[PDB]
């Protein structure tokens, strides 16, 4: 019937020059051709963390440290504290 | 009483040595855990931007 061609041309003309083909906008004044791929390119970027999580910053954290090559000094300190703890046993 | 108070440091010395070395090495090998943890965080961030 009339609708069988009218609505198909309606949904094949305006959507054609609305997106996918990505050129011009006939039905309504605001264009989404430069809105969804350009202005909304930073949309999720604004929603998410930018320059930290989107770029996955290669934060090279300081490597795990140690006793800094502590000499026998800490050894006899441990000896002394163990001795004074065990003296009252 | 002195005898059965003293008679404990015979078979426990080896246990003390092994526990000391094992605990110290496990504490000081946490570099592997840190590397795995940061890799996990970065993989999670990549997956996060993916579903975003």
Curated annotation (Swiss-Prot), chain A:
Higher taxonomy: Eukaryota, Fungi, Dikarya, Ascomycota, Saccharomycotina
Function in brief: Mitochondrial membrane ATP synthase (F(1)F(0) ATP synthase or Complex V) produces ATP from ADP in the presence of a proton gradient across the membrane which is generated by electron transport complexes of the respiratory chain. F-type ATPases consist of two structural domains, F(1) - containing the extramembraneous catalytic core and F(0) - containing the membrane proton channel, linked together by a central stalk and a peripheral stalk. During catalysis, ATP synthesis in the catalytic domain of F(1) is coupled via a rotary mechanism of the central stalk subunits to proton translocation.
Name recorded for this polypeptide: ATP synthase subunit H, mitochondrial
GO biological process terms held by the UniProt record: cristae formation; mitochondrial proton-transporting ATP synthase complex assembly; proton motive force-driven ATP synthesis; proton transmembrane transport
Compartments in which it is found: Mitochondrion; Mitochondrion inner membrane
Entry superkingdom: Eukaryota
Region of interest: Disordered: 54-89
One CC-aspect GO term: mitochondrion
Keyword Isomerase: no
Protein family per UniProt: Belongs to the ATPase h subunit family.
Keywords noted in UniProt: ATP synthesis, CF(0), Hydrogen ion transport, Ion transport, Membrane, Mitochondrion, Mitochondrion inner membrane, Transit peptide, Transport
Biased composition regions of type Acidic residues, renumbered to the chain: 65-89
Gene (name only): ATP14
Subunit field text: F-type ATPases have 2 components, CF(1) - the catalytic core - and CF(0) - the membrane proton channel. In yeast, the dimeric form of ATP synthase consists of 17 polypeptides: alpha, beta, gamma, delta, epsilon, 4 (B), 5 (OSCP), 6 (A), 8, 9 (C), d, E (Tim11), f, g, h, i/j and k.
Other information: Present with 6140 molecules/cell in log phase SD medium.
Parent-record interval covered: 36 to 124 of 124
Transmembrane stretches, start-end: none
Curated annotation (Swiss-Prot), chain B:
SS bond list: none
Top-level taxonomic group: Eukaryota
Subcellular location: Mitochondrion; Mitochondrion inner membrane
Signal peptide region: none
UniProt modified residues of type Phosphoserine: 5
Additional remark text: Present with 12900 molecules/cell in log phase SD medium.
Similarity annotation: Belongs to the eukaryotic ATPase B chain family.
Assembly behavior: F-type ATPases have 2 components, CF(1) - the catalytic core - and CF(0) - the membrane proton channel. In yeast, the dimeric form of ATP synthase consists of 17 polypeptides: alpha, beta, gamma, delta, epsilon, 4 (B), 5 (OSCP), 6 (A), 8, 9 (C), d, E (Tim11), f, g, h, i/j and k.
Function noted in UniProt: Mitochondrial membrane ATP synthase (F(1)F(0) ATP synthase or Complex V) produces ATP from ADP in the presence of a proton gradient across the membrane which is generated by electron transport complexes of the respiratory chain. F-type ATPases consist of two structural domains, F(1) - containing the extramembraneous catalytic core, and F(0) - containing the membrane proton channel, linked together by a central stalk and a peripheral stalk. During catalysis, ATP synthesis in the catalytic domain of F(1) is coupled via a rotary mechanism of the central stalk subunits to proton translocation.
Protein name per Swiss-Prot or TrEMBL: ATP synthase subunit 4, mitochondrial
Species whose genome carries this gene: Saccharomyces cerevisiae (strain ATCC 204508 / S288c)
């Amino acid at each position: 019937q009339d609708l069988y061609l009218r609505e198909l041309k309606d949904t094949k003309l305006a959507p054609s020059t609305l997106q996918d083909a990505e050129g011009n906008v006939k039905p309504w004044n605001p264009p989404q051709k430069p809105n969804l791929p350009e202005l909304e390119l930073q949309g999720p970027e604004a929603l998410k963390a930018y320059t930290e999580q989107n770029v996955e910053t290669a934060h090279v954290a300081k490597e795990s440290e140690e006793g800094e090559s502590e000499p026998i000094e800490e050894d006899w300190l441990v000896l002394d504290d163990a001795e004074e703890t065990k003296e009252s046993h | 009483d002195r005898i059965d108070s003293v008679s404990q440091l015979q078979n426990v010395a080896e246990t003390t040595k092994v526990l000391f070395d094992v605990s110290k090495e496990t504490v000081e090998l946490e570099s592997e855990a840190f590397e795995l943890k940061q890799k996990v965080e970065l993989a999670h961030e990549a997956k996060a931007v993916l579903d975003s």
